[PDB]
């Protein structure tokens, strides 16, 4: 965000780019983060959706405006053009409820009910997914899970929302899932997770 002067500020298009930056929360140390920018929210173009290396959840961050971000560098690395291994499975998987198997410590089975929401932008071979017992936005290469037998297959945008916790968290509806139009992405203030709910 450069003040190309006075009332104007210009901004590089970083959708699809690898980025790295520092992160400082309160009186902690700066931590180092490296991620792939997936999208820029239409109803709030300073808000980006980001997949960070080593974190399964997708995060929503105002990368240019959030004071907690420092030394924001967009990298020259280009995400490799991948073709999806089984396109038919990939396409038919969208919008479907799924049983996604996860291991806990020393191999006890933990099966999570979920819903595949979409093919991820930018990172072609990855899928947007959320879970009944954890309604935030996750990202995984599900065709790997499927081939290993670990995956079994079975507009309000712009509006604000409020959610009761003896508290109230307010948030905004930022995206409608194309495969299932009654399912939306929600970004709450002071939470960088993307929440996923059916708002029927």
């Amino acid at each position: 965000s450069s003040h190309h002067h006075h009332h104007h500020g210009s901004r590089r298009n970083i959708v699809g780019c690898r980025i790295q930056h520092g992160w400082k929360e309160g009186n902690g140390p700066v931590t180092q983060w490296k991620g792939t920018v997936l999208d820029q929210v239409p109803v709030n173009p300073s808000l980006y959706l980001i997949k960070y290396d080593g974190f399964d959840c997708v995060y929503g961050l105002e990368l240019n405006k959030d004071e907690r971000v420092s030394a924001l560098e967009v990298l020259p690395d280009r995400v490799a053009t991948s073709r999806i291994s089984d396109a038919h499975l990939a396409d038919t998987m969208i919008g479907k409820a799924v049983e996604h198997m996860f291991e806990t410590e020393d191999g006890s089975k933990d099966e999570w009910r979920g819903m595949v929401l979409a093919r991820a932008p930018v990172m072609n071979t990855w899928f947007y997914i959320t879970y009944e017992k954890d309604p935030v936005l996750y990202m995984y290469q599900l065709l790997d899970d499927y081939k290993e037998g670990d995956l079994r297959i079975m507009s309000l945008v712009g509006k604000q929302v409020e959610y009761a916790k003896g508290s109230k968290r307010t948030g905004m509806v930022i995206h409608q899932v194309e495969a299932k139009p009654s399912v939306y992405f929600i970004k709450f203030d002071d939470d960088f997770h993307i929440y996923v709910y059916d708002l029927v």
């Binding site: 959840c57 996860f102 291991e103 089975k109």
Partner: peptide
């Protein structure tokens, strides 16, 4: 199968 991380 995958392992679950934490928030």
């Amino acid at each position: 199968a995958r392992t679950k991380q934490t928030a």
